[PDB]
Assembly symmetry: C5
Homo-oligomer: 281 residues x 5
């Protein structure tokens, strides 16, 4: 007789929360240089995926097509290309600050990591991701000339795409950018939760694919992606200024993300699963 | 190799649904409220993403050729992430309860007071989460504001048109559409219990929710978010035309689909199997 | 790690099909009717969703450029979830039974009277489910009502044109198309029987269902729903055309495909393998 | 306890070679009529999937769409819907000549099958696939009237798509058709290898889908699909001749496909993995 | 009764690094002929998938369509069709130079391979991929006429797409070509890591699919794809020159792909997982 074995590749409820807490408290045990290296690699991967998505969007930001689709196909394609960043980050074992704003905050709420340790991890991850992203921007994208102003509408679709995304990201106000970053980090935290839950390749790919595509097309502000995009837009001499790039956007973006991951998502999840995490431990 | 299966039969899926509904009636009130609020917030967030994508594909010059088609298709492609954002974190939505908890009430595993308390708390929490996300994120972000310029005002136009379409049905029409919506939603809930592999977990629910959204059926929580955002953004709808015209018939149709349309036939089909299962323990 | 196999050779698939057919000849008449009606309801729901999507992509300005290609493609994209709905709820349609139960008939595991019970009840219940959904949900939804304005009439126009296409074949053509449809459905049943993984379950049947849908092959239960809702919304078709001209040929072709096209050859192939498995 | 057991579904390399050789050797012991039936069933499945792909491509061959898109969308949809023939064949346990060219040839290289049996298997598979494909082309396509000349540019796009594909397939010279068939059978045997190394259902589906879609879009010639398409085109009275169908596309396509299955892939893999196979047999 | 076994098919980070080092070491023992055959087969597969991608892009390079969408549709379709190559390489057991620039370089850093062995394997893989790709560009692509210059513009879309792609690849400078190569191979090495960490068919297909499509659409330059494309362009008499192929694109491409495989990725991951591998081997 045939007796195939019934197997579950997914979990839920308290299991995912406990795994998230464990993943968070794991990171504070690394040394400063290991954390720096991981953050640098994550920032570089984000920059690579962002460059690829920008090339695709500029491809679909073409002069004549844009007059019909009005910048719709380009954003869809950019959001279709970006998600692979999650695979790059997770498979290499590197971490991104946006995910940490949930994982390490959860670990801290349970009182696994300490406040100074949390500060160390957050600061190192942020710095590493930032310098990784800007280094990739320069060395790969800026020197490749892929985003240079050609001064000819027929060929300048990539530069125009970058300029238009930068202007969109730069002409918000404080509160609107904060809100967009909140939504961004909600999506990112949900994606990390998904991978923490769906312990299979299919889920690992597609759940975070849909999450990242949704937050990319939606227009939510991601701190690392915004750092890369704003820096490279500055490099290729778009209309955005450095004061605009940093004060207007990246400060409210970091904040929104921080709130989304720590207060909006971490605190109620902790309130829900505190007793379960205790019972497991 | 060892032969395995991640898919169970209908009897086992019915048992799993009954148990999943039963367990709902043991959480304290505050945890149920928190989980319902989280589910409502997730639905509002994914609806915001879907609406922004649809508006992007609602470009005024693209309308003239494919009017309302690409925008709706993209909205239905983007929305289904909410099912994952709910399941992977243990949150619950009223719609899936309208099947699971009533099925657990049929088999005598819940009590009437318990059932009504659970349903009321779930609905109120979902409402709070959805409206809170709508206001804060969507309306402090200016994403759907009126720009008074046809070339740029496609997000507002898409939202206004969807809101009018929703609030211009009749009672019977809306009841039928909500019935269809909840049949799809509860069928996806059944899928996530019969399929225990990540690939199925994502894709079955994706297809179900996409068919829901494209078919124009009516979902109570998504409707709450959409009409509240259409009211603060000041489209051409009215508070009465929102609540009385859509959500009351929508809620009634959703509950009918959950409890009567599918709950009773499944109960009659599988009550003997459940009784035997119980005799086995 | 550990080496795991999620598939079966095909002899095991044949044994699984025979056992699946044998199982459903044991339920009560009422349980069978309930499952058949739920299956009909599911197919009606998915047909409604796919028809609405096709109507949306039937907009007249887009239609003047792309014909009906986009509408048909999107309808085929939306339809397939019906397989998931039926399989996950434990219900059956006539089309799948044409293979599953006819196999157990050949293998002597089901008797003629029980086979006729299963077949008749499945057909009647699927009919009841389809028409009831068509009335209660589709007709009262007003989605496919004739809004004479040409620009909003795409939903009605799509259904009208599809109904005309279905009812304007000849006997032989409709029988052939139904044969193709039921061959695809039986192959999807074999797919789910063979692939015990979520990815398999979803995609193997998704592609097959979309293929038969776009190909213009005729499904008896989907045809029932479409023709009944077309009559409800007052398209150009007649009841005589709906039933005599299309439905009877469609049923005949689907049964022939499920019973003689795939049943007899697979039996002649795997009869010894099943004999030994029974040992 | 949170300790799921680690599993792997892809076990490739030497193991895939063993699986291919044993799958080729299993075909040796089946009776003649069993192989004949399996071949006929596979040919019918190919005919069905090719009919579906042709109808979809014709649907996207609308003349107004054509004058702004050419055939690109039509071929894209054709290759998007065709790939289910592989699943139809493999799930039901039938055999196709193109996929046999690798496995049965490899089992003959290892001296597991004998030359007489190998010739029997190849001949029966080819003949049965021919019968199945032509039978589906007549009894399910010609009678369905789906590909019929309507004589209206608005409605005749299915017949026009089929006619254009047929004319394209019968204007190659010997060398070009042989080359395209070589590419096609490389893709087909490679899909067979992927299915032999993937045992999840997910890869089982999508690896095959991508391989067959690439082969279809690239224009590589598949012998079985070519018989189906050319026969249905002749039945409907397209701008084509039986000479152009058989002595200008089918023979070179068969030769190229067989060479790709047996020489381009095969002997290479034999050289790579025969010592590993010998060690396996020592076990 | 109802109690499925919890299973995971994914183990990233540390385990992926260990498996990468082991995979790198496994190459340093194959015989010269075996490695050459594997590299030739991999080059042949890359040529086949590049030919299919080019044909699809040429289909979607129709002059009327191109006049509206430019080259967006053709590039997307090429990126959709190409990723199948990874599947060919992994399932056949063959090897490609670009993934070796990480795997074998890692096995060298850990000292599981020697320097002579590493250089031999790397050069053999490169030469075999060269021979396979060129033999496919001749015996399959050129001899089929699929990319012939059929002057009439209505049908001359495959040739025009190939010509424009070649002109794009040929008209960079040293630094830009090197950077785009660095990007391509970071993507290829990440796809290899995806394959090594995910041990299920779904991930196998889809992670590498997305990585390869992202690299291809992004315009990043792959040495094996570059050789195939430029050789077939030379064969079909495009506007590029014999010198412009090798001294303008393939030399910088190879350089940058090697940098990506070895220093950009290899050094940080080594500095991350060195002591953990030390632990794992004791
Ligand atoms: C290792 O576990 C993880 C995995 C992913 C992230 C993450 O945050 C990734 C992004 O934010 C992103 F930008 F790459 C994308 F949105 F694309 F996913 C993380 O922090 C930790
Ligand atoms: C078993 O865990 C679940 C998962 C999902 C739901 C649910 O209700 C989902 C929807 O309602 C939805 F898909 F329509 C959307 F989320 F988009 F709103 C649920 O009730 C319970
Ligand atoms: C094993 O559980 C099942 C699942 C499906 C069927 C079936 O028959 C499917 C169709 O008929 C269909 F594909 F046409 C559609 F689903 F669209 F209705 C069945 O018989 C049994
Ligand atoms: C039983 O295991 C198999 C599986 C597949 C084939 C095969 O050959 C498949 C094709 O050739 C194909 F994909 F091109 C199409 F089906 F489309 F024709 C085979 O021979 C044997
Ligand atoms: C056997 O394990 C592998 C599998 C694949 C590669 C590889 O490198 C493949 C490519 O580079 C490529 F050409 F297919 C693409 F550029 F698309 F990625 C490898 O090195 C080792």
């Amino acid at each position: 007789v045939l007796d195939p074995v019934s197997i579950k590749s997914v979990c839920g409820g308290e299991e995912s929360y406990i795994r998230c807490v464990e993943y968070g408290k794991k990171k504070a045990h690394y040394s400063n240089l290991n954390l720096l290296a991981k953050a640098i690699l994550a920032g570089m991967f984000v920059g690579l995926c962002a460059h690829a998505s920008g090339i695709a969007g500029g491809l679909f930001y073409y002069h004549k097509l844009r007059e019909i689709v009005g910048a719709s196909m380009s954003v869809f394609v950019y959001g279709f290309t970006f998600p692979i960043a999650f695979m790059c980050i997770i498979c290499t074992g590197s971490d991104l600050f946006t995910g940490n704003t949930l994982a390490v905050t959860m670990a801290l709420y349970e009182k696994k990591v300490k406040l100074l340790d949390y500060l160390r991890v957050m600061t190192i991850s942020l710095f590493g991701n930032y310098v990784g992203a800007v280094s990739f921007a320069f060395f790969v994208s800026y020197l490749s000339g892929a985003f240079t102003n050609v001064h000819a509408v027929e060929k300048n679709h990539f530069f125009q795409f970058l300029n238009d995304i930068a202007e969109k990201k730069v002409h918000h106000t404080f509160v609107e950018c904060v809100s967009l970053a909140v939504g961004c980090n909600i999506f990112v935290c949900l994606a990390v939760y998904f991978v923490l839950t769906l312990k299979d390749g299919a889920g690992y790919v597609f759940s975070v694919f849909f999450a990242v595509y949704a937050f990319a097309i939606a227009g939510y502000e991601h701190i690392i992606a915004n750092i890369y995009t704003l820096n490279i837009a500055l490099m290729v001499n778009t209309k955005i200024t450095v004061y605009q790039a940093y004060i207007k956007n990246l400060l409210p973006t970091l904040l929104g993300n921080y709130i989304a991951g720590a207060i909006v998502l971490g605190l109620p999840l902790y309130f829900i699963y505190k007793e379960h995490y205790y019972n497991f431990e």
